[model samples]
Target: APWKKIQQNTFTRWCNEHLKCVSKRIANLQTDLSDGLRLIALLEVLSQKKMHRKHNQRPTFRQMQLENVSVALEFLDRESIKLVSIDSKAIVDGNLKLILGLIWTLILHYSISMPQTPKQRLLGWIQNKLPQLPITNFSRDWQSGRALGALVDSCAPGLCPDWDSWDASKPVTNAREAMQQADDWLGIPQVITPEEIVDPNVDKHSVMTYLSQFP
Candidate 1:
């Protein structure tokens, strides 16, 4: 894949650009349910800004980054580094709550129905409260290869109607049903044998000898 040619460190740009577009599309499909999706879009833009600032160090903020809650949570997760001086008010912003809701919806999409952790409780609660409502149903004739239709198809296969010719607009009813049809479109390994996690304690020379002469 062309993506493989890019260095791992440089791949964030590709991720940001792709997700940014997806977020924008989600925001455009506004309904009562879309509040969460809109928050996700805003968070995506905020994250991209933070990423740029980190890499280029050109834009500096006098205040703390609590407003960038979504990215702050993400950076904390991946780097095990906590950002200090967070404003409590930002934590409860409706936008933050909405983003948390969408995230839990995605989790529930994967079949995790209950929360066991404090963080999970917060996310699960938001997911429970968010509604699923319809918005614009743009005619397929209005869409083409480069529009939202193609993007949705790229994200989920056979999941969206033909964007160019379908009678309906966005958020096809059948599309929602299709999402309900399966969670693990990707199968998961069910078990892990203990042996897979261990190495034989013998020296490297002996290990190679054992492998070279194994029955």
Candidate 2:
């Protein structure tokens, strides 16, 4: 896949959600699955198959590592889901590439193949634009105005490119610079002031109103 968006972190949580039952939740897609036991953890839960605890859990050598992933690989074969491609050897080598080699397919088959909410109306589009940000709220999340700067830059590079350097220590400064750059570069009016946006309980509707102008 061209990777329309990099949701490696998002997919980690998705896997963690199902894998939680086994108490084998994952962190990074890269480091966690090298042994393939974590992979089997997800496999058993996703298919609700009888546990594939056959692979020796402890030794953690190349042979058993490949052994575990191989079974889960065909375990999905039984699921009748076809991914782009993956080999257990690659999965065993376990560098960054193994993730795209295998886990991206899992994310696509589960989340992409499957499927939002009201705040989600505008929020959904914002989240889609910059999947890098952990923006799940309008209150404290937006207080730093870092999200706004990123939002403006997301429209077109350099419109507010310095946003990533924003200082959380000066939330209003970020708010000021973001609104200032947006007005100068993008011609969006500053209908709302920076202080209001940095407020702890800033109104979501007002923030939405101001952000609606960013095209």
Candidate 3:
């Protein structure tokens, strides 16, 4: 009886009037299906990686451990609540948005600590900004302290600067020194290294440490 009634109802008109509704329903269903597939695929990847690492490869990352990943997820979930509470204006003003973006990008570098997954990358991006430099660099005094004898040396370790025994206190000089500091500024190399030089790695780390201190 219902089938007969539907045939009685004009099928052409019904299809035309409900076309938009039908399309919307299909779209929603597709979205839901995609989400499910994404979750399943991500879980499968993690599982396979874990299983492969157990027998073949040594786990390169400390966080890749099953227990650690679970812990990280829990921590990330709590932190996400904090992230959403702040508005877009807050993000732009606070610069956390950019910082998070950089951190997540860095995490994905794989050469660093660990590669990130899509499920957790956003939160990791947010978390990375929590302890990063806050502002643009190379203001007034940095230009004056162009004494990057160490910076240059660190940048090119194991070659000209005696990779094993570079001293930050030593004044490294020449044509490019001023150019490297900044333009339209009084650039003078600053002496921040040990007068009595010792280890190159120490000087390298110290130079990096100074750069890290930028905010």
Candidate 4:
């Protein structure tokens, strides 16, 4: 049975507490009657506000990083340093989140004596760590390769030679040698400073001709 239905004053008081817009339609409604309408209105309001649960809404990469940090904080403890080292290695081998966790742990604990170009180290860490991090999905593999490529480019521009045009006959022997060759290739000055030519006779064509004449 419905409770003792509220009259004007009681209805107005309830409206004052809850309703933003108290209209004639709402005021005419009994308190119990109003509850059902209010529930519907609340649902509408939530829908209007886009408070509906998003089916496709996943956490962005950075936001998900918070969990990675939490994991690092939990596992990467001083007492369990050995365990952390192994875990960190495993994490690095697993996913981006874990790699970031590993990086956080390394910096947080070993800040004073952490290696230089740590990002580069982590990027290069992929070489041997490749065996540990087996390729999984197509998208993941693609992104991982791109990430590594970008890291390689940042560490030393053009370090990852154009694989498309690479000679099939002379294949890269070892990782160390490949890295050295990449360094050597990039070591040559790309933009040489032009010397002031006192005699106007030394133009681009003449300079190229003279340079081409040499071995």
Candidate 5:
């Protein structure tokens, strides 16, 4: 009995250490997901506000879509901080991907459905606002070409641009503009380590004082 208790205690201690490490990894991933949701919510609201401002008269179908997207944004914002059950690594990753995909679909539906004018005003608004989003890097996927075509088909079906007619060597070809179009202008590299910093107290210290101490 005594030996059994001792072995049980040791086994639990070993498992607890590993569990702590695993929990930390899960927490970090959860935070990343949370931030991603919030970022999408901000992007959605920003684009939606611009849409409302541009078009004073909203049609029933468009308004319904906007309403649902607003609800989706609110849900995402709530879920950002909510405790999600980590059933398994696969389930967690899969569910997050699916949810994000759905959110993007909703966003694309509303944004693309805006009536296009002869001057391509709708396209211009989206291009300008979309690049400002921190999530456009996700849009650089290989499927983006097909996704773009599908969205165009949904938005303005009869007005589909002839893909075969366009040459790759044109002034602004897809090959030349792909990366530039998909990049997040607001995105920044993450700081990975403490030693990489030149000053720890730079936040409180004045720029002049920090510079003087640098040497």
Candidate 6:
């Protein structure tokens, strides 16, 4: 599988997005959660309940470190969320590889896995309309303006009809035309900036959010 910039775009904010619910925060996954206190807090916060009993306040000891993480895993079990090939030992040891995997697993269940009708509604509709596109995911395929032009054109007929004529070398201009046309003609106001959609690191949610306004 190809690697993504998940650490930059998704994972950190994904962790804090839910963790922010109870004011638990993290700076780095490797060192920050080794103590497991914040991890317990996250579990408790997401579940909206205590951890059966108070987790050890001082998590400086090794056995207690293991226990804290172990219990957090238990919280997942109780919630019917399953983890495979992950253990508290690797987490307490601050292994970045395993730590990233653990957080990804947690994010998978908590955020995307349970939703059946959500990402599909907008993304699926995009696929249905853009049958000519080699598009698979939401973000990177859109950077060169071909897809954007195709999408806007697909809405009607001639709005952004010049797909091949658009300059791939000038993505910002292509994006400008797309957003301006979509706003002025299609009544979908330009909420997301053109430069953002033109960015190499454009977020999928940003594209979906703007596209959701289209008829």
What's each prediction's TM-score? 0.20, 0.48, 0.19, 0.18, 0.23, 0.60
lDDT of 6 by residue, 108-215 (tens): 555444435446666677788899777776677788877878888899879888976888888888988987888788876664567767677776754654565663
lDDT of 3 at 29: 20
Q: List the residue pairs that clash in candidate 5.
A: none
| Cα-based lDDT for every prediction | 0.30, 0.69, 0.27, 0.30, 0.29, 0.72
Cα miss at 8, model 2 (Å)? 1.9
Ranking by TM-score: 6, 2, 5, 1, 3, 4
- Report the Cα lDDT for candidate 3: 0.27
A best-first ranking of the candidates according to their lDDT comes to: 6, 2, 4, 1, 5, 3
Model 4 accuracy (lDDT, Cα): 0.30
Q: What's model 5's TM-score?
A: 0.23
| Number of the top lDDT candidate | 6
Clashes of 2: 0
The window of 10 residues in a row where model 3 has the poorest summed lDDT is 6-15
- Which pairs, if any, clash in model 3? 135-215, 147-189, 164-200, 165-200, 166-200, 168-193, 169-193
Candidate 4 clashes: the total is: 0
For each predicted model, how many residue pairs clash, with residues at least 3 apart or on different chains?
4, 0, 7, 0, 0, 0
lDDT of 5 by residue, 1-215 (tens): 33322222222222232334334212232223332333233433424432222211232354443443444344444434222332223222445544334423332333233225312443344345334322222113212233222223333443324432434234223322321222222121111111111122222111111111111
Candidate 6 segments whose C-alpha is farther than 4 A from its true place? 1-9, 116-134, 145-215
